Amino acid sequence: NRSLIVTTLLEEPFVMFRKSDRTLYGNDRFEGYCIDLLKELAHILGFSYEIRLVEDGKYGAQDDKGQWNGMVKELIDHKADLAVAPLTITHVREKAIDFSKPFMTLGVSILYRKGTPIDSADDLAKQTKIEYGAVKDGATMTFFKKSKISTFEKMWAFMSSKPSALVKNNEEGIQRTLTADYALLMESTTIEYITQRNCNLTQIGGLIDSKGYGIGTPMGSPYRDKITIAILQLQEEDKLHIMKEKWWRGSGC
Amino acid sequence: NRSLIVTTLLEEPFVMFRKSDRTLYGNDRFEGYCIDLLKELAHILGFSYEIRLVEDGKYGAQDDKGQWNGMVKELIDHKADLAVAPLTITHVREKAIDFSKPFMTLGVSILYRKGTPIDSADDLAKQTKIEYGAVKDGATMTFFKKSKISTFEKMWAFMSSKPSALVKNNEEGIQRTLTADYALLMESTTIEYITQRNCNLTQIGGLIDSKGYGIGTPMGSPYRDKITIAILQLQEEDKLHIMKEKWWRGSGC
Ligand SMILES: CN(O)C(=O)CC[C@H](C[C@H](N)C(=O)O)C(=O)O
Ligand SMILES: CN(O)C(=O)CC[C@H](C[C@H](N)C(=O)O)C(=O)O
Ligand SMILES: [Cl-]
Ligand SMILES: [Cl-]
Ligand SMILES: [K+]
Ligand SMILES: [K+]
Ligand SMILES: [K+]
Ligand SMILES: [K+]
16 A cells, blocks of 8 residues: 555646745645646545656657657556556557546647648648647657558658657747747647637647547556546546636636 | 356457357357457466357447447446457547457458459549448447548548448448449458458558457456456467468468
8 A cells, every 4th residue: 555656747737846935845846637636536546646757758659669768668667657647548559558548538739820821731731831740759749650641641751851840848849839930739638728828829720630648557557447437437527627627727818 | 267258249250150060059159260369368367258149249339329239338238248359449439348458450441342443532532423331330430430531521421321331240241342333441451351252352542540459348357457468478479460360361362
Protein backbone atom coordinates (compact mmCIF):
# COMPACT_ATOMS: atom_id res chain seq x y z
CA ASN A 1 0.00 0.00 0.00
CA ARG A 2 2.82 2.44 -0.97
CA SER A 3 2.53 5.76 -2.80
CA LEU A 4 2.34 5.34 -6.58
CA ILE A 5 4.82 7.26 -8.75
CA VAL A 6 2.98 9.58 -11.15
CA THR A 7 4.70 10.89 -14.28
CA THR A 8 3.46 14.07 -15.86
CA LEU A 9 4.39 17.26 -17.72
CA LEU A 10 3.28 20.88 -17.93
CA GLU A 11 0.25 21.59 -20.13
CA GLU A 12 -2.48 24.20 -19.63
CA PRO A 13 -4.93 23.56 -18.31
CA PHE A 14 -4.28 19.89 -17.40
CA VAL A 15 -1.13 20.17 -15.28
CA MET A 16 0.29 23.48 -14.05
CA PHE A 17 2.34 25.06 -11.38
CA ARG A 18 -0.14 26.63 -9.00
CA LYS A 19 0.56 30.24 -8.04
CA SER A 20 1.77 30.96 -4.47
CA ASP A 21 3.89 33.52 -2.64
CA ARG A 22 5.86 30.84 -0.84
CA THR A 23 7.98 28.15 -2.51
CA LEU A 24 5.92 25.02 -3.10
CA TYR A 25 7.15 21.46 -2.88
CA GLY A 26 5.72 18.01 -3.44
CA ASN A 27 2.31 17.40 -4.95
CA ASP A 28 1.29 20.83 -3.66
CA ARG A 29 3.20 22.40 -6.57
CA PHE A 30 0.59 21.15 -9.04
CA GLU A 31 -2.98 21.99 -10.10
CA GLY A 32 -5.18 21.58 -13.15
CA TYR A 33 -7.78 19.32 -14.67
CA CYS A 34 -5.62 16.15 -14.32
CA ILE A 35 -4.64 17.03 -10.81
CA ASP A 36 -8.36 17.18 -10.00
CA LEU A 37 -8.83 13.90 -11.76
CA LEU A 38 -5.89 12.25 -9.98
CA LYS A 39 -7.21 13.56 -6.66
CA GLU A 40 -10.67 12.10 -7.37
CA LEU A 41 -9.22 8.67 -8.32
CA ALA A 42 -6.97 8.67 -5.25
CA HIS A 43 -10.06 9.29 -3.09
CA ILE A 44 -12.35 6.73 -4.76
CA LEU A 45 -9.59 4.09 -4.94
CA GLY A 46 -7.74 4.84 -1.70
CA PHE A 47 -4.19 5.43 -2.94
CA SER A 48 -1.58 8.17 -2.54
CA TYR A 49 0.99 9.28 -5.05
CA GLU A 50 4.15 11.23 -5.65
CA ILE A 51 3.99 13.37 -8.81
CA ARG A 52 7.17 13.68 -10.93
CA LEU A 53 7.72 15.63 -14.13
CA VAL A 54 9.19 13.51 -16.94
CA GLU A 55 12.80 14.59 -17.41
CA ASP A 56 12.80 14.97 -21.22
CA GLY A 57 9.44 16.78 -21.08
CA LYS A 58 7.88 14.57 -23.78
CA TYR A 59 4.70 12.52 -24.12
CA GLY A 60 6.45 9.82 -26.11
CA ALA A 61 7.26 8.54 -29.59
CA GLN A 62 9.28 5.66 -31.07
CA ASP A 63 12.60 6.59 -32.69
CA ASP A 64 13.99 4.94 -35.87
CA LYS A 65 15.43 2.08 -33.80
CA GLY A 66 12.07 1.48 -32.07
CA GLN A 67 13.05 3.21 -28.84
CA TRP A 68 10.54 5.23 -26.81
CA ASN A 69 10.99 8.53 -25.01
CA GLY A 70 8.83 10.76 -22.86
CA MET A 71 6.23 9.43 -20.42
CA VAL A 72 5.72 6.28 -22.51
CA LYS A 73 9.38 5.42 -21.85
CA GLU A 74 8.81 6.16 -18.16
CA LEU A 75 6.11 3.50 -17.89
CA ILE A 76 7.99 0.99 -20.08
CA ASP A 77 11.01 1.35 -17.83
CA HIS A 78 8.74 1.11 -14.75
CA LYS A 79 10.09 4.40 -13.39
CA ALA A 80 6.49 5.60 -12.92
CA ASP A 81 3.32 3.72 -12.00
CA LEU A 82 0.94 6.06 -13.80
CA ALA A 83 1.13 8.70 -16.51
CA VAL A 84 -1.45 11.31 -15.58
CA ALA A 85 -1.46 13.94 -18.32
CA PRO A 86 -3.41 14.63 -21.53
CA LEU A 87 -1.97 11.39 -22.98
CA THR A 88 -3.47 10.20 -26.25
CA ILE A 89 -4.52 6.56 -26.44
CA THR A 90 -3.03 5.33 -29.70
CA HIS A 91 -2.85 1.74 -30.89
CA VAL A 92 0.80 2.45 -31.70
CA ARG A 93 1.58 3.20 -28.06
CA GLU A 94 -0.54 0.21 -26.97
CA LYS A 95 2.33 -2.00 -28.09
CA ALA A 96 4.58 -0.53 -25.37
CA ILE A 97 2.23 0.41 -22.56
CA ASP A 98 -1.40 0.19 -21.40
CA PHE A 99 -4.17 2.76 -21.24
CA SER A 100 -7.15 3.18 -18.97
CA LYS A 101 -10.51 3.82 -20.61
CA PRO A 102 -10.51 7.42 -21.98
CA PHE A 103 -11.50 10.33 -19.69
CA MET A 104 -11.81 12.89 -22.51
CA THR A 105 -12.50 12.75 -26.26
CA LEU A 106 -10.82 15.09 -28.72
CA GLY A 107 -9.78 15.25 -32.37
CA VAL A 108 -6.88 16.69 -34.27
CA SER A 109 -7.69 20.07 -35.76
CA ILE A 110 -5.77 23.17 -36.91
CA LEU A 111 -4.87 26.16 -34.74
CA TYR A 112 -4.22 29.25 -36.84
CA ARG A 113 -4.13 33.05 -36.79
CA LYS A 114 -7.35 34.59 -38.16
CA GLY A 115 -6.86 36.20 -41.58
CA THR A 116 -6.24 33.91 -44.55
CA PRO A 117 -9.58 32.11 -44.88
CA ILE A 118 -8.35 28.51 -45.05
CA ASP A 119 -11.10 26.10 -44.05
CA SER A 120 -9.44 22.68 -44.18
CA ALA A 121 -6.17 20.76 -44.08
CA ASP A 122 -6.37 20.33 -47.87
CA ASP A 123 -5.67 24.06 -48.10
CA LEU A 124 -2.47 23.63 -46.10
CA ALA A 125 -1.23 20.47 -47.82
CA LYS A 126 -1.45 22.09 -51.26
CA GLN A 127 0.75 25.10 -50.45
CA THR A 128 4.19 25.93 -49.02
CA LYS A 129 3.56 29.58 -47.98
CA ILE A 130 1.76 29.13 -44.66
CA GLU A 131 4.09 26.73 -42.88
CA TYR A 132 2.44 24.15 -40.60
CA GLY A 133 3.56 21.51 -38.12
CA ALA A 134 3.08 19.65 -34.84
CA VAL A 135 4.70 18.92 -31.46
CA LYS A 136 7.84 16.82 -31.89
CA ASP A 137 7.41 13.26 -30.54
CA GLY A 138 3.70 13.56 -29.82
CA ALA A 139 0.57 11.73 -30.95
CA THR A 140 -0.31 14.37 -33.55
CA MET A 141 3.09 14.07 -35.25
CA THR A 142 2.94 10.26 -35.20
CA PHE A 143 -0.59 10.31 -36.61
CA PHE A 144 0.85 12.16 -39.60
CA LYS A 145 3.96 9.97 -39.77
CA LYS A 146 1.72 6.89 -39.90
CA SER A 147 -1.13 8.03 -42.13
CA LYS A 148 -2.17 6.50 -45.45
CA ILE A 149 -4.43 9.41 -46.48
CA SER A 150 -2.79 11.24 -49.42
CA THR A 151 -3.61 14.64 -47.88
CA PHE A 152 -1.91 13.83 -44.52
CA GLU A 153 0.83 11.93 -46.38
CA LYS A 154 1.34 15.21 -48.26
CA MET A 155 1.31 17.25 -45.00
CA TRP A 156 3.70 14.93 -43.17
CA ALA A 157 6.00 15.23 -46.20
CA PHE A 158 6.17 18.94 -45.40
CA MET A 159 6.78 18.68 -41.65
CA SER A 160 9.34 15.93 -42.29
CA SER A 161 11.15 18.40 -44.53
CA LYS A 162 11.14 21.61 -42.47
CA PRO A 163 13.50 21.85 -39.41
CA SER A 164 11.37 24.44 -37.63
CA ALA A 165 7.95 22.91 -38.31
CA LEU A 166 8.08 20.40 -35.45
CA VAL A 167 7.92 22.32 -32.18
CA LYS A 168 9.30 21.38 -28.76
CA ASN A 169 5.97 21.80 -26.97
CA ASN A 170 2.46 23.21 -27.12
CA GLU A 171 3.47 26.60 -25.65
CA GLU A 172 6.22 27.17 -28.22
CA GLY A 173 3.84 26.19 -31.05
CA ILE A 174 1.12 28.60 -29.95
CA GLN A 175 3.86 31.26 -29.89
CA ARG A 176 4.76 30.47 -33.50
CA THR A 177 1.16 30.77 -34.64
CA LEU A 178 1.19 34.24 -33.06
CA THR A 179 4.60 35.34 -34.43
CA ALA A 180 4.81 33.63 -37.84
CA ASP A 181 2.56 32.68 -40.73
CA TYR A 182 2.16 29.23 -39.21
CA ALA A 183 -0.54 26.67 -38.49
CA LEU A 184 -0.14 24.25 -35.57
CA LEU A 185 -1.68 20.77 -35.84
CA MET A 186 -3.19 20.35 -32.38
CA GLU A 187 -5.77 18.56 -30.29
CA SER A 188 -9.38 19.75 -30.22
CA THR A 189 -10.04 20.38 -26.53
CA THR A 190 -6.75 22.32 -26.26
CA ILE A 191 -7.66 24.44 -29.30
CA GLU A 192 -10.91 25.24 -27.45
CA TYR A 193 -9.00 26.55 -24.44
CA ILE A 194 -6.32 28.42 -26.46
CA THR A 195 -8.81 30.19 -28.76
CA GLN A 196 -10.86 31.39 -25.77
CA ARG A 197 -7.81 33.09 -24.27
CA ASN A 198 -6.22 34.24 -27.53
CA CYS A 199 -8.72 36.05 -29.71
CA ASN A 200 -6.52 36.40 -32.80
CA LEU A 201 -6.36 32.60 -32.88
CA THR A 202 -9.08 30.34 -34.27
CA GLN A 203 -9.76 26.75 -35.16
CA ILE A 204 -9.53 25.80 -38.83
CA GLY A 205 -11.80 23.03 -40.07
CA GLY A 206 -13.52 20.57 -37.80
CA LEU A 207 -12.02 17.37 -36.41
CA ILE A 208 -9.50 15.49 -38.52
CA ASP A 209 -10.15 12.35 -36.52
CA SER A 210 -11.46 11.03 -33.21
CA LYS A 211 -9.55 9.82 -30.13
CA GLY A 212 -9.25 9.85 -26.36
CA TYR A 213 -7.00 10.76 -23.46
CA GLY A 214 -6.23 7.95 -21.08
CA ILE A 215 -4.18 7.30 -17.98
CA GLY A 216 -1.05 5.40 -18.96
CA THR A 217 0.31 2.48 -16.98
CA PRO A 218 3.05 -0.08 -17.63
CA MET A 219 1.72 -3.22 -19.32
CA GLY A 220 -0.17 -5.55 -16.95
CA SER A 221 -0.45 -2.93 -14.21
CA PRO A 222 -2.77 -3.84 -11.27
CA TYR A 223 -4.32 -0.35 -11.16
CA ARG A 224 -5.27 -0.23 -14.82
CA ASP A 225 -8.67 -1.81 -14.22
CA LYS A 226 -9.49 -0.10 -10.88
CA ILE A 227 -8.72 3.25 -12.54
CA THR A 228 -10.74 2.42 -15.70
CA ILE A 229 -13.80 1.58 -13.58
CA ALA A 230 -13.61 4.70 -11.45
CA ILE A 231 -13.14 6.87 -14.54
CA LEU A 232 -16.27 5.25 -16.03
CA GLN A 233 -18.28 5.94 -12.85
CA LEU A 234 -17.13 9.58 -12.86
CA GLN A 235 -18.10 9.78 -16.50
CA GLU A 236 -21.61 8.39 -16.14
CA GLU A 237 -22.47 10.99 -13.51
CA ASP A 238 -21.01 13.56 -15.90
CA LYS A 239 -18.44 14.73 -13.33
CA LEU A 240 -15.74 14.82 -15.97
CA HIS A 241 -17.84 17.23 -18.02
CA ILE A 242 -18.09 19.40 -14.93
CA MET A 243 -14.38 19.16 -14.19
CA LYS A 244 -13.72 20.23 -17.74
CA GLU A 245 -16.01 23.25 -17.45
CA LYS A 246 -14.20 24.32 -14.28
CA TRP A 247 -10.82 24.55 -16.08
CA TRP A 248 -12.06 25.79 -19.50
CA ARG A 249 -14.33 28.53 -18.13
CA GLY A 250 -12.65 31.65 -19.49
CA SER A 251 -13.22 35.21 -20.76
CA GLY A 252 -14.57 35.02 -24.30
CA CYS A 253 -14.10 36.78 -27.64
CA ASN B 1 -9.52 -23.57 -12.46
CA ARG B 2 -12.66 -24.24 -14.59
CA SER B 3 -12.95 -24.35 -18.39
CA LEU B 4 -13.32 -20.89 -19.93
CA ILE B 5 -16.26 -20.24 -22.26
CA VAL B 6 -15.03 -19.21 -25.72
CA THR B 7 -17.32 -17.37 -28.13
CA THR B 8 -16.63 -17.54 -31.82
CA LEU B 9 -18.12 -17.67 -35.32
CA LEU B 10 -17.38 -19.24 -38.69
CA GLU B 11 -14.80 -17.47 -40.86
CA GLU B 12 -12.27 -18.98 -43.26
CA PRO B 13 -9.60 -19.57 -42.44
CA PHE B 14 -9.78 -18.52 -38.76
CA VAL B 15 -12.57 -20.75 -37.45
CA MET B 16 -14.06 -23.63 -39.45
CA PHE B 17 -15.81 -26.90 -39.15
CA ARG B 18 -13.14 -29.52 -39.70
CA LYS B 19 -13.99 -32.25 -42.19
CA SER B 20 -14.70 -35.77 -40.85
CA ASP B 21 -16.73 -38.84 -41.80
CA ARG B 22 -18.15 -39.18 -38.32
CA THR B 23 -20.25 -36.56 -36.51
CA LEU B 24 -18.04 -34.27 -34.45
CA TYR B 25 -18.91 -32.74 -31.11
CA GLY B 26 -17.28 -30.37 -28.67
CA ASN B 27 -14.10 -28.46 -29.43
CA ASP B 28 -13.20 -31.23 -31.87
CA ARG B 29 -15.67 -29.72 -34.36
CA PHE B 30 -13.37 -26.74 -34.93
CA GLU B 31 -10.11 -25.95 -36.72
CA GLY B 32 -8.38 -22.94 -38.22
CA TYR B 33 -5.85 -20.25 -37.45
CA CYS B 34 -7.64 -19.11 -34.24
CA ILE B 35 -8.14 -22.65 -33.09
CA ASP B 36 -4.37 -23.09 -33.40
CA LEU B 37 -3.89 -19.86 -31.54
CA LEU B 38 -6.36 -20.80 -28.80
CA LYS B 39 -4.66 -24.19 -28.47
CA GLU B 40 -1.24 -22.53 -28.11
CA LEU B 41 -2.51 -20.09 -25.43
CA ALA B 42 -4.24 -22.91 -23.56
CA HIS B 43 -0.93 -24.80 -23.49
CA ILE B 44 1.30 -21.86 -22.49
CA LEU B 45 -1.21 -20.59 -19.90
CA GLY B 46 -2.59 -23.91 -18.64
CA PHE B 47 -6.33 -23.47 -19.21
CA SER B 48 -9.09 -25.45 -20.94
CA TYR B 49 -12.10 -24.10 -22.75
CA GLU B 50 -15.48 -24.86 -24.22
CA ILE B 51 -16.00 -23.25 -27.64
CA ARG B 52 -19.48 -21.88 -28.45
CA LEU B 53 -20.69 -20.20 -31.63
CA VAL B 54 -22.39 -16.83 -30.98
CA GLU B 55 -26.11 -17.31 -31.58
CA ASP B 56 -26.73 -14.25 -33.80
CA GLY B 57 -23.57 -15.00 -35.79
CA LYS B 58 -22.26 -11.42 -35.49
CA TYR B 59 -18.99 -9.81 -34.40
CA GLY B 60 -20.79 -6.87 -32.81
CA ALA B 61 -22.01 -3.32 -33.32
CA GLN B 62 -23.98 -0.75 -31.29
CA ASP B 63 -27.58 -0.14 -32.36
CA ASP B 64 -29.29 3.29 -32.32
CA LYS B 65 -30.13 2.86 -28.62
CA GLY B 66 -26.51 2.00 -27.78
CA GLN B 67 -27.12 -1.74 -27.50
CA TRP B 68 -24.52 -4.29 -28.61
CA ASN B 69 -24.97 -7.55 -30.45
CA GLY B 70 -22.71 -10.34 -31.63
CA MET B 71 -19.65 -11.51 -29.69
CA VAL B 72 -19.20 -8.07 -28.12
CA LYS B 73 -22.62 -8.52 -26.48
CA GLU B 74 -21.55 -12.00 -25.37
CA LEU B 75 -18.62 -10.63 -23.39
CA ILE B 76 -20.58 -7.63 -22.04
CA ASP B 77 -23.24 -10.01 -20.76
CA HIS B 78 -20.50 -12.31 -19.37
CA LYS B 79 -21.92 -15.28 -21.30
CA ALA B 80 -18.41 -15.98 -22.65
CA ASP B 81 -14.97 -15.52 -21.08
CA LEU B 82 -13.13 -14.97 -24.34
CA ALA B 83 -13.96 -14.03 -27.91
CA VAL B 84 -11.51 -15.93 -30.08
CA ALA B 85 -12.17 -14.94 -33.69
CA PRO B 86 -10.80 -12.37 -36.18
CA LEU B 87 -12.15 -9.61 -33.91
CA THR B 88 -11.09 -6.07 -34.75
CA ILE B 89 -9.76 -3.94 -31.89
CA THR B 90 -11.62 -0.66 -32.23
CA HIS B 91 -11.67 2.17 -29.72
CA VAL B 92 -15.44 2.18 -30.17
CA ARG B 93 -15.71 -1.38 -28.88
CA GLU B 94 -13.19 -0.59 -26.12
CA LYS B 95 -15.99 1.24 -24.34
CA ALA B 96 -17.92 -2.03 -23.89
CA ILE B 97 -15.25 -4.71 -23.67
CA ASP B 98 -11.48 -5.26 -23.47
CA PHE B 99 -8.96 -6.48 -26.01
CA SER B 100 -5.71 -8.36 -25.71
CA LYS B 101 -2.72 -6.99 -27.59
CA PRO B 102 -3.24 -7.67 -31.35
CA PHE B 103 -2.18 -11.03 -32.85
CA MET B 104 -2.54 -9.91 -36.47
CA THR B 105 -2.42 -6.57 -38.33
CA LEU B 106 -4.67 -5.82 -41.29
CA GLY B 107 -6.27 -2.87 -43.08
CA VAL B 108 -9.55 -2.24 -44.80
CA SER B 109 -9.28 -2.63 -48.55
CA ILE B 110 -11.63 -3.41 -51.47
CA LEU B 111 -12.44 -6.87 -52.81
CA TYR B 112 -13.68 -6.72 -56.39
CA ARG B 113 -14.10 -8.72 -59.60
CA LYS B 114 -11.28 -8.05 -62.09
CA GLY B 115 -12.43 -6.00 -65.08
CA THR B 116 -13.30 -2.34 -64.52
CA PRO B 117 -9.91 -0.85 -63.65
CA ILE B 118 -10.83 1.04 -60.48
CA ASP B 119 -7.75 1.66 -58.35
CA SER B 120 -9.10 3.38 -55.23
CA ALA B 121 -12.13 3.99 -53.04
CA ASP B 122 -12.48 7.46 -54.58
CA ASP B 123 -13.54 5.68 -57.77
CA LEU B 124 -16.34 3.91 -55.91
CA ALA B 125 -17.55 6.89 -53.88
CA LYS B 126 -18.00 9.02 -57.00
CA GLN B 127 -20.32 6.59 -58.84
CA THR B 128 -23.55 4.64 -58.30
CA LYS B 129 -23.09 1.94 -60.99
CA ILE B 130 -20.77 -0.51 -59.24
CA GLU B 131 -22.57 -1.00 -55.94
CA TYR B 132 -20.36 -1.49 -52.87
CA GLY B 133 -20.84 -2.35 -49.21
CA ALA B 134 -19.70 -4.16 -46.06
CA VAL B 135 -20.70 -6.82 -43.51
CA LYS B 136 -23.67 -5.65 -41.44
CA ASP B 137 -22.73 -4.93 -37.80
CA GLY B 138 -18.99 -5.37 -38.27
CA ALA B 139 -15.93 -3.20 -37.76
CA THR B 140 -15.69 -2.25 -41.44
CA MET B 141 -19.28 -0.95 -41.51
CA THR B 142 -18.78 0.97 -38.25
CA PHE B 143 -15.53 2.47 -39.54
CA PHE B 144 -17.58 3.95 -42.38
CA LYS B 145 -20.48 4.93 -40.11
CA LYS B 146 -18.02 6.83 -37.89
CA SER B 147 -15.66 8.40 -40.42
CA LYS B 148 -15.01 12.12 -40.92
CA ILE B 149 -13.21 11.70 -44.26
CA SER B 150 -15.44 13.13 -47.04
CA THR B 151 -14.70 10.14 -49.29
CA PHE B 152 -15.77 7.54 -46.68
CA GLU B 153 -18.59 9.85 -45.55
CA LYS B 154 -19.68 9.73 -49.21
CA MET B 155 -19.32 5.91 -49.33
CA TRP B 156 -21.19 5.33 -46.07
CA ALA B 157 -23.94 7.55 -47.47
CA PHE B 158 -24.32 4.95 -50.22
CA MET B 159 -24.31 1.83 -48.04
CA SER B 160 -26.69 3.56 -45.61
CA SER B 161 -29.04 4.05 -48.56
CA LYS B 162 -28.99 0.64 -50.27
CA PRO B 163 -30.86 -2.30 -48.59
CA SER B 164 -28.72 -4.97 -50.25
CA ALA B 165 -25.32 -3.29 -49.82
CA LEU B 166 -24.78 -4.47 -46.23
CA VAL B 167 -24.29 -8.23 -46.27
CA LYS B 168 -25.02 -10.79 -43.55
CA ASN B 169 -21.51 -12.24 -43.55
CA ASN B 170 -18.21 -12.52 -45.37
CA GLU B 171 -19.27 -15.60 -47.37
CA GLU B 172 -22.42 -13.95 -48.72
CA GLY B 173 -20.44 -10.82 -49.65
CA ILE B 174 -17.80 -12.75 -51.59
CA GLN B 175 -20.73 -14.40 -53.40
CA ARG B 176 -22.10 -10.99 -54.38
CA THR B 177 -18.77 -9.85 -55.76
CA LEU B 178 -18.86 -12.98 -57.94
CA THR B 179 -22.52 -12.68 -59.02
CA ALA B 180 -23.11 -8.92 -59.22
CA ASP B 181 -21.26 -5.76 -60.20
CA TYR B 182 -20.33 -5.25 -56.56
CA ALA B 183 -17.32 -4.31 -54.44
CA LEU B 184 -17.05 -5.60 -50.85
CA LEU B 185 -15.27 -3.46 -48.26
CA MET B 186 -13.21 -6.06 -46.42
CA GLU B 187 -10.19 -6.70 -44.25
CA SER B 188 -6.74 -7.05 -45.79
CA THR B 189 -5.56 -10.46 -44.60
CA THR B 190 -8.93 -11.99 -45.61
CA ILE B 191 -8.69 -10.39 -49.07
CA GLU B 192 -5.28 -12.10 -49.34
CA TYR B 193 -6.81 -15.50 -48.67
CA ILE B 194 -9.93 -14.98 -50.85
CA THR B 195 -7.99 -13.70 -53.89
CA GLN B 196 -5.62 -16.68 -53.76
CA ARG B 197 -8.54 -19.11 -53.99
CA ASN B 198 -10.70 -17.05 -56.34
CA CYS B 199 -8.75 -15.90 -59.35
CA ASN B 200 -11.42 -13.63 -60.85
CA LEU B 201 -11.25 -11.63 -57.61
CA THR B 202 -8.59 -9.05 -56.79
CA GLN B 203 -7.74 -6.38 -54.28
CA ILE B 204 -8.45 -2.78 -55.25
CA GLY B 205 -6.17 -0.11 -53.86
CA GLY B 206 -3.91 -0.63 -50.90
CA LEU B 207 -4.88 -0.31 -47.24
CA ILE B 208 -7.53 2.24 -46.29
CA ASP B 209 -6.29 2.19 -42.71
CA SER B 210 -4.38 0.16 -40.16
CA LYS B 211 -5.67 -2.02 -37.29
CA GLY B 212 -5.38 -5.28 -35.40
CA TYR B 213 -7.23 -8.43 -34.38
CA GLY B 214 -7.36 -9.09 -30.69
CA ILE B 215 -8.84 -11.59 -28.27
CA GLY B 216 -11.91 -10.05 -26.65
CA THR B 217 -12.68 -10.36 -22.96
CA PRO B 218 -15.24 -8.74 -20.67
CA MET B 219 -13.93 -5.57 -19.03
CA GLY B 220 -11.49 -6.23 -16.17
CA SER B 221 -11.03 -9.89 -17.08
CA PRO B 222 -8.21 -11.73 -15.21
CA TYR B 223 -6.97 -13.47 -18.37
CA ARG B 224 -6.61 -10.33 -20.45
CA ASP B 225 -3.04 -9.73 -19.32
CA LYS B 226 -1.86 -13.38 -19.26
CA ILE B 227 -3.18 -13.75 -22.82
CA THR B 228 -1.61 -10.44 -23.99
CA ILE B 229 1.81 -11.56 -22.70
CA ALA B 230 1.67 -14.99 -24.28
CA ILE B 231 0.55 -13.51 -27.59
CA LEU B 232 3.54 -11.12 -27.43
CA GLN B 233 5.94 -14.02 -26.76
CA LEU B 234 4.49 -15.98 -29.69
CA GLN B 235 4.86 -12.88 -31.82
CA GLU B 236 8.49 -12.17 -30.99
CA GLU B 237 9.52 -15.67 -32.04
CA ASP B 238 7.48 -15.07 -35.20
CA LYS B 239 5.25 -18.10 -34.52
CA LEU B 240 2.18 -16.13 -35.49
CA HIS B 241 3.71 -15.43 -38.89
CA ILE B 242 4.25 -19.16 -39.25
CA MET B 243 0.73 -19.99 -38.10
CA LYS B 244 -0.57 -17.57 -40.68
CA GLU B 245 1.46 -19.16 -43.47
CA LYS B 246 0.08 -22.58 -42.53
CA TRP B 247 -3.55 -21.46 -43.10
CA TRP B 248 -2.97 -19.06 -46.04
CA ARG B 249 -0.77 -21.43 -48.05
CA GLY B 250 -2.91 -22.02 -51.14
CA SER B 251 -2.85 -22.71 -54.89
CA GLY B 252 -2.06 -19.47 -56.70
CA CYS B 253 -3.20 -17.56 -59.78
C1 LIG C 1 -3.02 18.66 -24.84
N1 LIG C 1 -1.70 18.38 -25.38
O1 LIG C 1 -1.12 17.28 -24.71
C2 LIG C 1 -1.07 19.09 -26.39
O2 LIG C 1 -1.70 19.82 -27.16
C3 LIG C 1 0.44 18.95 -26.57
C4 LIG C 1 0.85 18.02 -27.73
C5 LIG C 1 -0.05 16.77 -27.99
C6 LIG C 1 0.32 15.56 -27.11
C7 LIG C 1 -0.55 14.31 -27.29
N2 LIG C 1 -1.80 14.44 -26.42
C8 LIG C 1 0.30 13.00 -27.04
O3 LIG C 1 -0.17 12.18 -26.17
O4 LIG C 1 1.38 12.87 -27.69
C9 LIG C 1 0.01 16.45 -29.48
O5 LIG C 1 0.88 15.63 -29.87
O6 LIG C 1 -0.85 17.06 -30.19
C1 LIG D 1 -12.06 -11.65 -41.20
N1 LIG D 1 -13.42 -11.17 -41.03
O1 LIG D 1 -13.78 -11.22 -39.66
C2 LIG D 1 -14.26 -10.72 -42.03
O2 LIG D 1 -13.82 -10.38 -43.14
C3 LIG D 1 -15.76 -10.63 -41.77
C4 LIG D 1 -16.25 -9.19 -41.49
C5 LIG D 1 -15.30 -8.26 -40.69
C6 LIG D 1 -15.42 -8.42 -39.16
C7 LIG D 1 -14.48 -7.55 -38.32
N2 LIG D 1 -13.13 -8.24 -38.19
C8 LIG D 1 -15.17 -7.17 -36.94
O3 LIG D 1 -14.50 -7.44 -35.89
O4 LIG D 1 -16.31 -6.64 -36.99
C9 LIG D 1 -15.56 -6.82 -41.15
O5 LIG D 1 -16.41 -6.14 -40.50
O6 LIG D 1 -14.88 -6.45 -42.15
CL1 LIG E 1 9.16 16.75 -10.37
CL1 LIG F 1 -21.62 -24.10 -30.50
K1 LIG G 1 6.11 30.54 -5.71
K1 LIG H 1 -0.90 5.03 0.74
K1 LIG I 1 -19.12 -34.89 -40.43
K1 LIG J 1 -8.96 -26.70 -16.53
